[PDB]
Amino acid sequence: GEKISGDDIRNQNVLATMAVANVVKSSLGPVGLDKMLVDDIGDFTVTNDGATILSLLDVQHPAGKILVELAQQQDREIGDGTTSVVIIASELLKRANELVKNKIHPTTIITGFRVALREAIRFINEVLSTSVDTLGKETLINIAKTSMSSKIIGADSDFFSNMVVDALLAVKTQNSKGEIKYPVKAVNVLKAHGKSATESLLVPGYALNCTVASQAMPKRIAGGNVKIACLDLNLQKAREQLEQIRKREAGIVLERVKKIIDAGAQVVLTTKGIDDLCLKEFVEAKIMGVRRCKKEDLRRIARATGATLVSSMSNLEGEETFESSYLGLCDEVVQAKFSDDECILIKGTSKHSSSSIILRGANDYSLDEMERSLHDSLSVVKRTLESGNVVPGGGCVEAALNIYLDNFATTVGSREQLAIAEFAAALLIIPKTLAVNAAKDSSELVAKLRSYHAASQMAKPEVKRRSYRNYGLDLIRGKIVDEIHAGVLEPTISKVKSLKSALEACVAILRIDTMITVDPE
Amino acid sequence: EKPQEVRKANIIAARSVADAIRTSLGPKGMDKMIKTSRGEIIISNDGHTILKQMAILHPVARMLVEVSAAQDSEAGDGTTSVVILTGALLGAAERLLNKGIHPTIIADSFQSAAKRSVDILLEMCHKVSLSDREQLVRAASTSLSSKIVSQYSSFLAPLAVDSVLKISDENSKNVDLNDIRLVKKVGGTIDDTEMIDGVVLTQTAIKSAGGPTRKEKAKIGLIQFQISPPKEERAYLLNICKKIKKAKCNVLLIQKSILRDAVNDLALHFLSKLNIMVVKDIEREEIEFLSKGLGCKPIADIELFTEDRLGSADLVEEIDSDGSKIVRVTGIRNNNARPTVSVVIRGANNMIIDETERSLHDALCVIRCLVKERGLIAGGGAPEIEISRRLSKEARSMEGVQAFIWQEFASALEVIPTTLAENAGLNSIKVVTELRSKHENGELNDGISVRRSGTTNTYEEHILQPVLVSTSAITLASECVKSILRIDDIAFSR
Amino acid sequence: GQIISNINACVAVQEALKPTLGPLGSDILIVTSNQKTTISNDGATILKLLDVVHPAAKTLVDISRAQDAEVGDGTTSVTILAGELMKEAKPFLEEGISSHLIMKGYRKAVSLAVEKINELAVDITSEKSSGRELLERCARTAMSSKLIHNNADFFVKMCVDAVLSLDRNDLDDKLIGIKKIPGGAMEESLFINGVAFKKTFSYAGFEQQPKKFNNPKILSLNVELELAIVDAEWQLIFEKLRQVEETGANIVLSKLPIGDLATQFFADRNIFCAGRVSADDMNRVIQAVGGSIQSTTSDIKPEHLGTCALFEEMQIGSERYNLFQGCPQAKTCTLLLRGGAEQVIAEVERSLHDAIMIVKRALQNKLIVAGGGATEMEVSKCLRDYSKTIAGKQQMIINAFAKALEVIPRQLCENAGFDAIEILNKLRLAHSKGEKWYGVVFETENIGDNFAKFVWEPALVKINALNSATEATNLILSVDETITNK
Amino acid sequence: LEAKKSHILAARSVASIIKTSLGPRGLDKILISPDGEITITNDGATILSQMELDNEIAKLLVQLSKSQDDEIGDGTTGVVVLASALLDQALELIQKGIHPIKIANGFDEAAKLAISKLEETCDDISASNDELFRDFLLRAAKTSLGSKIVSKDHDRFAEMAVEAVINVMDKDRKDVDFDLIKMQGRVGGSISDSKLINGVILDKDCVLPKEGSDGVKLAILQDKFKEMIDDVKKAGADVVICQWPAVRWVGGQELEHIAISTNGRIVPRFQDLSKDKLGTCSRIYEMLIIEQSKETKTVTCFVRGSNKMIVDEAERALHDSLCVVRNLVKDSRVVYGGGAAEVTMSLAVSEEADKQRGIDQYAFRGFAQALDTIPMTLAENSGLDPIGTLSTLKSKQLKEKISNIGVDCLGYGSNDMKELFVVDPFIGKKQQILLATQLCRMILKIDNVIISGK
């Protein structure tokens, strides 16, 4: 079919790249703005998340879809910074275009970026810091403020700081051959409206959204040794031989409930609704029935309370029974009204302890953004506790590393130093884009910040304390502030994997030479 | 002269394919992006993949795909070099038709020169041991660096060599690659690629209940049928499980049953109640790999199920890494004459995973030529001009006009160093000028190097190629161009 | 945004002149509606005949036309700098940086550049090179920096001796005009000490013309001589011929042609006469012989008749021309080009006229600096250290102008076939740890010292180059909109 | 480099047009004038000058041949072939990465070696007496200048033209006159009817000679008609030409040759008629025939022919001999061409390439290969193998010291040019090589061609 080769394809690759790059430019930084997407189904979705946009984004260019899969891999590896990482592919491929039109060979561009990022780890070793960082009184709050970038939660992040920290405090467990980590992605988030952001409650346990059929049951259980059972089977009314089968099936249901009553389970979790036959057995046995449960939420209950889901009741023989090993354990069961509904609160579980988060917002479009923003912050603390090395935030990292690459280019020399200079100018778009979203001047703070880092490497003792060297930048007032007063920092694993995952991503665009379009059937 | 115009248009179609792949030749080659009609984007420089999705209505251009496919059957590697050899002889055939040379004379000139080129390669062979490390990488090092991931190939170079040396023979056999399976998974990096000494199944089972997390001292079975009532109910399925526990089979392998028996929820709960590991949704093509590797006989009926048809394994566990579910088998019993291994491939994007996979199949086929023939020759297009030195020198003995086409075959060998100079960003004539003076006298194996930009020893840069790579390809490429000149015209029929 | 669209159209102006930089440069072929073939390296004739679309293209033409007064040569290495300053300024114009900071920062960079150029220019005088040396040894490669590579050795021993007769404080460009003689050789051109012009008209006594005069006298007369009515018209013309003989003029220059009566009267008395004299040739005789032009015979007097040493009739190219020698006042030496190719005559015509500009500025001040594009490299090296502390954002602004001067060594390597990166690494150490004067050498194809290479260039060329590129680049930034009626 | 590659291929197509016209044996091609008239002539300079192509590259070769026509006039084909040969080798050396000036510098250095080698082969024909010298001038046009058919014996009308410039030029062997040597054609009769006299014959309109005067008393100038006769009777002029015996409607420029040969002058008006303008003419008789038996430099060859192209082609061959004879008289350096000096100078340049080596070895080889294109072109025009022709010439010049062996186009047998009397001007071959390379340096400097809007 259509076959077109030459340098026009690489010029078209960056043209389609810069076209979709404008999507994440306005959403970068705490002051970034959201954008509305039309789903053509009558509704719309307003999101600044690059992972959600690139998924729905329609790209008619074959190479433009590579950036879509790049954000998907960064969600499992990192889980945050979607618009603060992928955005570099705009100018990085644009500066390489000037080298393609010149006599620079693509391998020099490829090997130039590899030697730059390989030796960049030693440059990062200067800005690293331990997990203790300052004198304390703020520990996981400083890393919780990392999610302020690219998101609008920075205004309400004051009260939400202690909510995220305390949610991951009691979920501690032992895994990874004895390593102590927090099993994230297991936190339940409930959507609610009313009051304000400061009224958000943190539940140190499991929260279930359902409706209790009979209010006369022991809704609130006082004391320990609470047994909870889980059954995937549906016990209800279901299909003169028709009346005889109805009586035989009713006896089978009452027999299976009798096995649960004999086990002493205080809470019975069912997938579907409960008929009137099972409700009469629960009141006499002082058991609270639960209906309309989601299978995905029941999987976390099996790990938390310790109640394994029962697919079917059977054994090696033809006897049906419910074993006692499928019962869960917790400290107490408390039921309170949460947002025009009564939810079950399971706290103090035996096997594993979980946590639930209740959020408040304006509308459903606001809660969708507030949920994913705080959900991505859970991975920020998780990835930070894995590697104690941390780097300061504020965009001062990209401006500082580009100065060391200037003398590093003179060390290597030859033709590989020109690609290093172009790679240093490519990283300068990150601090300049933040100035555009902050309605400030671009080169104003960039030229000044690089002046403090220019003499940073020239200081022999570090003369007295730090006259020039410092970290952090103030986007609101457009001034250079210290990282201690600003209180902003970012994890190292997020910054290293940023350019590391983008390494093979940008080169893949450069490796494209001949473009061929086959006509569809 | 209608037949002369048809062959002239065939050369243009041959040069069009050769000019496109020219950018992808050598280790400095460039990838090609093609948009398939199904909506999948595949970007690779492999000539087998490029010509697979190539859609051209020209009859000879369609035949050129089978020409490159024939090189994959005999060799299976060197797609950055030997692919242009098909269009190399056709590019110089334009002046041969103007001289009035009969096509059979052209076919006899290239066939006679093909046998002479083999004898030249047999003079340059080197001694290569059957078991070694650095020397076996030098022959593959030309083909080892193609994709962006070649930076991490430093660890992958001994891995691809030790993978073939694991299962092989010292009698110089065909070295079938069916025993070595490359399994892939989502997550990880290519630097974390590891090799396993036993069968690793990456197929994702339904895992409804998923009760057992692993099995210790289990017997891995092979079941073609499916456990389900023909299409009191549970009593029939429990009796089948009693026969399974009678032979002490804790691991069941079942193919895809959705065609007829589909899947039953009661059968999944019975195996989890007894903690019996089972894997479903298995393709039919995997029956040959699981039967010969583990030494298990297929069982088409529950009556034929017995202990003699079941294998055994030390430990059978399921590894969970980066969200991917893979099954590793520790130890193998009922050993046979066809042992199998496995290599776990780790990647991020599905295109990147398939990108590194084609690089491994290209590397594994290199040792197959070294085991069959211990001879070794220089790489990087160095012998291409060296062979031409022994050809054009004898042109004075061709006794008549045969010397003209005899030099054209030697001049066609200059296409290999010409494409490497343009792909590496160097002058074309400056390389050819240095080669003609270097290949004139001193020693052997010398030639141009794209890394050092000069004529020197190729083994100093650890760049070489097996002798069978250019031996079978040039003979096959010279044979395919003979049938191309046999086309008088293109006539459409029913 | 409107300026960016105007720059891209002006980029192709110097990109067509891209290979023309340096002595290895190429030429541009121009064919007009009259089918006049013009092949020359100088962009002044190129931009004059170049079709312009946007008015910004005329800006480079006005600077190129004014370049003859400021410098006059090296136009390939000057005009290209006007487009390079706006090429790298595109990322700055797209950002919040205003074009005023680029214009204001440019004058701050030129003020520091000219200060260093005057520092690089050193005048020893004293016992070092003097007249006939600086104009020969140091001006060997300085006179022609582009063309006349093979014939350079011929003109150093010829053209230098012609400009030696020109004294300082005069610098007359009216007497340096050349002529076009078909046929001959370049190195065989004869030196002419007086006014020489073409006959443009053939005579029946062309072979009978007097060979030479011992004491010739040139008289300029505008009287038209052309023939009861027959006796009256013949007598009036005869009376005018007798009044001219009373002055004793052996050479009579007539503006309008003369008939047979005036020719036969002058031939019998061996009196020379030439018709169809152009007005430009008359002013050349006034500044050489010192005569005067008489409209009629009423005011003609014997003291208005000038004289010169001797007259000679030269025959070259199968045609004879008038040759004057030993004029009373001659400030230059007339040169006559030769050769059979018309393009070659016009090729060296632009080159020789550009070489006199060096002699003009050398007589005022004698100064030489390192040539071969090494001047901008030392200036760009100094601007990198100063601009860091100068007025905030001006660091990146001056560094853009510092990298804009890097186009000169990149162009010299394009023609010679060298590497643009390899020359920058060698000069960076040569202009820092290697002090200053180390330049680039094309002959040995490596880096060497221009002091021992004998190749120098006047620093006054680079001084006016920045001033000529000042208002040229500032006008592009100062115009944000262009309107074309109809 | 891609722009000049198409210009070289376009320049080779122009050389292929005149490729068959090279040499005296060279065959012409039919040229059609834009007005519809057909032009058939064997002169290579006439067809190439009148032919106009589209691309400007071909027009640059027209200006090169324009100077060759006014100077040499015969054999201008070798100028374009040598210039195109330098561009044909430019497709290789320039592609190798060498700058054109570096290759152009080797051409100027090799040209000085060819001129110095050509000077050693000069043979002076003026060392003998006037009997053998004047015979060599007639035999010079017998072979080299002979091109068109029927020229096999042209000496009937050629000796009149050869002896024309001999009587005009002094015996000091240095003279040049372009004023009084012209060709006057006539349509009719045959080419064999030409005559050689001193004077000029016009197309416009007898008396016995006198004692003291040289005869006919030629004077260059009803009551008014007889009054002017009385003024003639004062001078006694028998024949008088009256512009403003009598003539009607005669031109002023046509009477210039009469006044110069007879030492007369033009009379503007009858009042200015005087005896001092009386000339001398031997005989005037009828179309009047003007003859002068005295010593004068005015000689005009009256030529007849049945067609215009027959007279035009015959005059251009005889008129171009003026520069040939001048180079055989005024210039004492005479060399033997036609494959002799071209191959001899090529062997000297080939030996210089191996001495310098470096980048000039391939540069000097291109200059020697360019000179070898002339004998290969003449070989195809003569029906001989180009490889076998050059292999024979180079084998004899290395073994034998005779440098006069050259290509035989017409089958003259022995290849010695000294025995065949084939002579070429020394300054001719010098100007053809320099001016050709002069243009080739400008062709390699072409970047982008600017053409005014239509």
Side-chain angles (χ1 to χ4, degrees), chain A residues 297-318:
Chain A
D297 290 344
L298 295 175
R299 296 177 63 185
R300 294 178 179 84
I301 295 170
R303 182 177 181 171
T305 60
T308 300
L309 295 175
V310 176
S311 296
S312 178
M313 293 178 181
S314 64
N315 57 33
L316 178 63
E317 296 301 321

Side-chain angles (χ1 to χ4, degrees), chain D residues 283-301:
Chain D
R283 292 173 296 180
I284 293 171
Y285 62 91
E286 183 178 2
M287 177 178 71
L288 295 175
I289 294 171
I290 294 171
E291 295 177 351
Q292 185 174 355
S293 63
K294 301 299 182 181
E295 182 178 2
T296 187
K297 294 181 181 297
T298 300
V299 175
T300 300
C301 183

